[PDB]
Amino acid sequence: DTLVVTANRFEQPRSTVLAPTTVVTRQDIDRWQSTSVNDVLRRLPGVDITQNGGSGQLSSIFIRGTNASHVLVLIDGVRLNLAGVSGSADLSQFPIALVQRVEYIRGPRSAVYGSDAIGGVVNIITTRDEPGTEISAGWGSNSYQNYDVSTQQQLGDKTRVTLLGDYAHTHGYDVVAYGNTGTQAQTDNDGFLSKTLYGALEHNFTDAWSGFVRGYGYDNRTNYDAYYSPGSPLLDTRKLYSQSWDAGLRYNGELIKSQLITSYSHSKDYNYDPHYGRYDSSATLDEMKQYTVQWANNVIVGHGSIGAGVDWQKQTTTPEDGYDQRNTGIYLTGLQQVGDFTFEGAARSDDNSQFGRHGTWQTSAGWEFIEGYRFIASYGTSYKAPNLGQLYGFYGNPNLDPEKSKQWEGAFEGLTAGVNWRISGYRNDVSDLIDYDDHTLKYYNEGKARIKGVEATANFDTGPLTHTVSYDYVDARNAITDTPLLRRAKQQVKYQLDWQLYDFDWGITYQYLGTRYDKDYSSYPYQTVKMGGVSLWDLAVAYPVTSHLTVRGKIANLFDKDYETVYGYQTAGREYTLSGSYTF
């Protein structure tokens, strides 16, 4: 196991987390030769992603079949900051260079974190420890190119620093669109450019008390497609800027853990064509500022812990009505162990300045009935806050309540003859779904979803061969009308194969994207169409040409499989990348 700290906010061992958690490390990501967050995520259990194309294009994540806004994305413990009016975050913009570790725990977790923890939680962590300085970059399949410098160091004792800058660029391909340009097209590759900057300070006043400060930021330009009058502007292009800063102290004692954290984030997300735009306009800007403050405690008691915090949010976006919004929550957590029984739980009330008070809880009990074998049940209750669009839009309704989930899940987990496996069943009923009525050009909370999913995983070695495999089946329907929701695969299958030989470290990663259902905007009324669903393979190698130098190479979409995760957006297709790192 591996500590991981994103279940109850403090360190703890995964074994000791009844819910399915998955962790991705740097080694991992470097292996994977991943070039985006999207890449990494798509691999793990329960994740369905979709893309209005290649790199840089919006994207969307469906954890166990919930809506794309029904996931909580945390960066370093802290809600992302998706600006605009749809929960949807789209980690297509979030520089992968920043990523040192992802920690991902599927299932509800609003009783710790609040809103969005409905499917599960994706905590992306920017923080390393792993001193030295590093150069690198790469080249490839669409004049893609990347360069990058890293270091962390000490400035005398109890202090260390960390800087990173990183530049990627690609020209891309046209992604056609097809029901989003109207009269004409693009016949234009729609590229992406991001440039990024990170700094850290890290400091112990002692071997218990510590602090940080961080600051980071990026500056992306990506090009997209739109709709079109001959006219009459486009909106070709998007330009996002985004900075964050944090501060905390921690104290980590033998029994009692504490943290006080702080952070402030501000983006500014221009869309525009492209000629006299800006600035025009003809030119939409969405800006946001989120502030955050949180203080938490835990301590050790039994083979258990108890913990609690308070946790405060302020988001002022800019335009007369939707602008400044505030949340505050207070929760409790508990772990314990008794015999071969674990019990783990959490609860929270939130007070939200639009919709007032709402609360939320979860439980799990496990039973290790034979050594190595273990049976877990869980129950849990989560929610999602209304968005401005829904609230204060043109069909806004500022009285909306949140959207409510209930989830049950059942799992067996075992070691058997060398294989670490798990399998797991869940029902999630969602409700008070926010659903506009043509009806009256207002939204209301009215709609219901059911989800029934199964998650099976395994890992093992045979040779010098390593196997990491999962299967996922998600049956996600509209409860009222009993049709399949959209853009979701009933079925996924993901294998990875790792091994080492001569000095070539090899990986081959397979996935099957099962078939799915969506909308063809080609023509109103708009109809749904069934996408067929498909098999990908990528091939990756690395070599330590020295001792400081690794040199890698990756063929992605190894055969050449055409397909979409969104009807009308062309996906990538076969790409090469050729890449290098020096250390010292």
Binding part of the chain for Ca ion, among 30-38, 132-140, 189-197, 475-483 by CB under 5 A, reads: 189-197
Residue type, 167: Y
Out of 363, 420, 431, 491, the residue judged to bind ligand C8E by CB under 6 A: 363
DSSP secondary structure string for all residues of 261-307: EEEEEEEEEEEE-SSS-SSSSS-EEEEEEEEEEEEEEEEEETTEEEE
Distance (Å, rounded) from C-alpha 496 to C-alpha 494? 7
Is residue 301 part of an annotated ligand binding site? no
Out of 209, 245, 251, 412, the residue judged to bind ligand C8E by CB under 6 A: 412
Q: Which of 361, 302, 340 is nearest to 117 (CA)?
A: 361
Instruction: Check binding of 487 to ligand CNC (CB under 6 A).
Output: yes
Binding part of the chain for ligand C8E, among 54-62, 423-431, 438-446, 507-515 by CB under 6 A, reads: 423-431
Q: Which of 548, 538, 580, 568 is nearest to 185 (CA)?
A: 568
Task: Compute the least distance from the CB of residue 401 to ligand C8E, in Å.
Answer: 13
Instruction: Check binding of 335 to ligand C8E (CB under 6 A).
Output: yes
* The total number of residues written for the chain in this structure: 584
Number of residues that bind ligand C8E (CB under 6 A): 41
Instruction: Check binding of 180 to ligand CNC (CB under 6 A).
Output: yes
Task: Compute the least distance from the CB of residue 38 to ligand CNC, in Å.
Answer: 12
Residue type, 515: T
The entry of Ca ion, ligand C8E, ligand CNC, none near residue 302 (CB within 5 to 8 angstroms by kind) is none
Residue type, 77: G
Distances (CA, A) of 43 to 22, 253, 472: 11, 36, 12
Is residue 224 part of an annotated ligand binding site? yes
The entry of ligand CNC, ligand C8E, Ca ion, none near residue 90 (CB within 5 to 8 angstroms by kind) is ligand CNC
> Going by C-beta distance under 8 Å and a sequence separation of 6 or more, which residues neighbour residue 318?
285, 286, 287, 288
Binding part of the chain for ligand C8E, among 47-55, 121-129, 201-209, 332-340 by CB under 6 A, reads: 332-340
With beta carbons less than 8 A apart as the criterion, state whether 382 and 360 touch.
yes
In the chain, after which residues does the backbone break, taking C–N over 2.5 angstroms as a break? 319
User: Which positions from 237 to 256 touch ligand CNC by CB under 6 A, shown as an x/- string?
Assistant: -x------------------
DSSP secondary structure string for all residues of 488-507: --SEEEEEEEEEE-SS-EEE
Binding part of the chain for Ca ion, among 223-231, 385-393, 425-433, 486-494 by CB under 5 A, reads: 223-231
Instruction: Indicate if the alpha-carbon torsion angle 34, 37, 43, 49 is positive or negative.
Output: negative
Out of 25, 88, 127, 243, the residue judged to bind ligand CNC by CB under 6 A: 88
Is residue 252 part of an annotated ligand binding site? no
Tokens for 557, please give them: 């979409």
Distance (Å, rounded) from C-alpha 133 to C-alpha 581? 11
Sheet holding 101-106, edge to edge: 21-24, 101-106, 120-125, 72-75, 78-79
Distance (Å, rounded) from C-alpha 301 to C-alpha 211? 25
Out of 39, 48, 76, 90, the residue judged to bind ligand CNC by CB under 6 A: 90
222 phi/psi in degrees, rounded to 5: -130, 155
Give all strands (DSSP E) within 318-441, no chain letters.
324-338, 341-352, 356-370, 373-384, 403-416, 419-437
Q: Which residue has the tokens 């400044």?
A: 324
Task: Compute the least distance from the CB of residue 343 to ligand CNC, in Å.
Answer: 35
Is residue 186 part of an annotated ligand binding site? yes
Is residue 110 part of an annotated ligand binding site? no
Binding part of the chain for ligand CNC, among 57-65, 200-208, 259-267, 399-407 by CB under 6 A, reads: 57-65
Residue type, 209: W
The entry of ligand CNC, Ca ion, ligand C8E, none near residue 410 (CB within 5 to 8 angstroms by kind) is ligand C8E
Out of 47, 58, 71, 474, the residue judged to bind ligand CNC by CB under 6 A: 58
The count of other CB atoms within 10 Å of the CB of residue 95 is 24
300 phi/psi in degrees, rounded to 5: -90, 130
Out of 21, 38, 60, 237, the residue judged to bind ligand CNC by CB under 6 A: 60
Task: Compute the least distance from the CB of residue 56 to ligand CNC, in Å.
Answer: 7
Task: Point out which residues pair with 15 in neighbouring strands.
Answer: none
Is residue 247 part of an annotated ligand binding site? no
The entry of ligand C8E, Ca ion, ligand CNC, none near residue 226 (CB within 5 to 8 angstroms by kind) is ligand CNC
Distance (Å, rounded) from C-alpha 533 to C-alpha 491? 9
Site residues for ligand C8E, 427-456, by CB under 6 A, read 427, 452-454, 456
User: Which positions from 454 to 493 touch ligand C8E by CB under 6 A, shown as an x/- string?
Assistant: x-xxx----------x-x-x-x------------------
Out of 110, 150, 271, 352, the residue judged to bind ligand CNC by CB under 6 A: 271
Is residue 346 part of an annotated ligand binding site? no
469 vs 551 by CB, closer to ligand C8E: 469
Out of 21, 141, 180, 186, the residue judged to bind Ca ion by CB under 5 A: 186
SS3 29: helix
Instruction: Check binding of 273 to ligand CNC (CB under 6 A).
Output: no
DSSP secondary structure string for all residues of 389-412: HHHHSSS--TT---EEEEEEEEEE
Instruction: Check binding of 223 to Ca ion (CB under 5 A).
Output: yes
Out of 134, 188, 287, 446, the residue judged to bind Ca ion by CB under 5 A: 188
With beta carbons less than 8 A apart as the criterion, state whether 391 and 414 touch.
no
Binding part of the chain for ligand CNC, among 211-219, 220-228, 345-353, 552-560 by CB under 6 A, reads: 220-228
Residue type, 469: V
What are the residues binding ligand C8E (CB under 6 A)?
A: 304, 306, 308, 330-332, 334-336, 343-349, 359-361, 363, 370, 373, 410, 412, 414, 421, 423-427, 452-454, 456-458, 469, 471, 473, 475
Instruction: Please report, in range form, the residues annotated as the binding site.
Output: 58, 60, 67, 85-86, 174, 186, 188, 190, 224-226, 236, 284, 487, 521
What are the residues binding ligand CNC (CB under 6 A)?
A: 52, 57-58, 60, 67-68, 84-86, 88, 90, 177, 180, 224-226, 235, 238, 271, 284, 286, 389, 486-487, 521, 566
Instruction: Please report, in range form, the residues annotated as the binding site for cyanocob(III)alamin.
Output: 58, 60, 67, 85-86, 226, 284, 487, 521
What are the residues binding Ca ion (CB under 5 A)?
A: 186, 188, 190, 223, 225, 401
